[PDB]
Structures are given as structure tokens and as C-alpha cells.
Design a protein around this ligand. Structure first.
Ligand SMILES: Nc1ncnc2c1ncn2[C@@H]1O[C@H](COP(=O)(O)CP(=O)(O)OP(=O)(O)O)[C@@H](O)[C@H]1O
Ligand SMILES: Nc1nc2[nH]c(SCC(=O)c3ccc(Br)cc3)nc2c(=O)[nH]1
Ligand SMILES: [Mg+2]
Ligand SMILES: [Mg+2]
Length: 158
């Protein structure tokens, strides 16, 4: 049985587009993950610590037989494959793979929260997410993505 999940990908170091492309390929090659939809890529001003490089961000849909914890392990392993050495959450990274949605399920473990608890105020997530998942309901707000998305001029088509 397959679970439909959504991942948020980001990169702000080096050849960002190549790193995101390779990440998608790696994710698709794991047993138990198939990438089923890919959003457009956006160039986005860094949010939070603003004095670091501009990001590329996108979202992907996957179909998965993995548990949410196994999925998290795969996401983290993919960052390691793309040589993410920096671990400062506020700082730059070659690759970030975030679990945005895991079916309509919700979990808030000390170190795994899904739906991603910050997604609803991030245009660098909601814009590419709305591109592929406009009618998907975000379980915490009980709103469809298209009803959460908002205009943000710092998010540009790449
Ligand atoms: N939904 C989720 N997806 C990915 N990681 C999550 C997560 N919820 C919690 N985490 C935790 O976040 C830890 C740190 O990961 P980082 O990628 O450095 C944070 P970040 O992605 O810069 O911030 P963000 O998760 O607010 O976007 C992971 O090891 C994981 O335990
Ligand atoms: N554009 C862009 N900016 C990013 N900043 C980060 S760190 C998490 C975060 O958003 C954050 C936002 C506000 C505060 Br306060 C602290 C952290 N990740 C990305 C990304 O993927 N894209
Ligand atoms: Mg992350
Ligand atoms: Mg992140």
C-alpha cells in the first residue's frame, strides 16, 4: 500500500540545480520511494538568517511504502549523499530534504513533526507546493494548499 507524501527540497551552496536534480534521482532510487510529481524550481531569498546565499527550492510528490521514520532516514541519507557537512539549522547547506506531508497523518515527536510545522508561513514551500498540490488538505489547518498560499516577491521563478 502506498502513502502519498510531499517533500520540500532546498539548496543554497554550489551548483544548486545539479544538487537538487541529483537528490530527486537518489530519492527515486530508494526501495519504497517513487517520485511521482515535481514542481517548478524557485529562487528564494534566504528566510531567518538572511546573510547567506539565495536558495533554490522545489517540492516533490512521492509514493512510498516506508514508515514516516524510514522516510526521514532516507531524506537525511540523501543530504549526506550530497555532502551536506554544515549542520547549523540556521546556516547554508548543499541540500535540505524536509518532509512536508505524509498522507493526512500528523505526528509531533520531539525531532520529527509532520506536517512540517513551519510550512504554512513559508512562501518558498507553499508556492512550489501549490503548483503540484493545490487541492491537498494540510491536516493541521484543515485548509487546502491553495487556501494557504500567499504572494511573496522574494520567491522568483528560476
Ligand atoms: N518534517 C521534517 N522533515 C525533516 N526533518 C525534520 C522534520 N521534523 C523535524 N525534523 C528534524 O530536523 C532535524 C534537523 O534538520 P535540518 O535539515 O538541519 C533543519 P532545517 O531543514 O534547516 O529547518 P526546517 O526543518 O525548519 O526547514 C532532522 O534531523 C529532523 O530530526
Ligand atoms: N529561501 C529559504 N530560506 C530558508 N531558510 C531556511 S532555515 C529555515 C527557515 O526557513 C527559517 C525561517 C525563519 C526563521 Br526565524 C528561522 C528559520 N531554509 C530555507 C529554505 O529552504 N529557503
Ligand atoms: Mg531539513
Ligand atoms: Mg528546511
Amino acid at each position: 500500500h502506498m502513502i502519498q507524501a510531499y517533500l520540500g527540497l532546498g539548496s543554497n551552496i554550489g551548483d544548486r540545480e545539479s544538487q537538487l536534480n541529483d537528490a530527486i534521482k537518489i530519492l527515486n532510487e530508494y526501495d519504497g520511494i517513487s517520485v511521482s510529481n515535481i514542481s517548478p524550481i524557485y529562487e528564494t531569498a534566504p528566510v531567518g538568517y538572511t546573510e547567506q546565499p539565495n536558495f533554490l527550492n522545489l517540492c516533490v510528490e512521492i509514493q512510498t511504502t516506508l514508515t514516516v521514520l524510514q522516510l526521514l532516514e532516507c531524506c537525511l541519507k540523501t543530504e549526506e549523499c550530497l555532502h551536506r557537512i554544515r549542520k547549523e539549522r540556521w546556516g547554508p547547506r548543499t541540500l535540505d530534504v524536509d518532509i512536508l506531508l505524509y498522507g493526512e497523518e500528523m505526528i509531533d515527536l520531539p525531532k520529527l513533526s509532520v506536517p512540517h510545522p513551519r510550512m504554512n508561513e513559508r512562501a518558498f514551500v507553499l508556492i512550489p507546493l501549490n503548483d503540484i498540490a493545490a487541492n491537498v488538505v494540510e491536516p493541521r489547518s484543515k485548509l487546502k494548499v491553495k487556501d494557504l498560499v500567499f504572494v511573496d516577491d522574494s520567491v522568483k521563478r528560476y
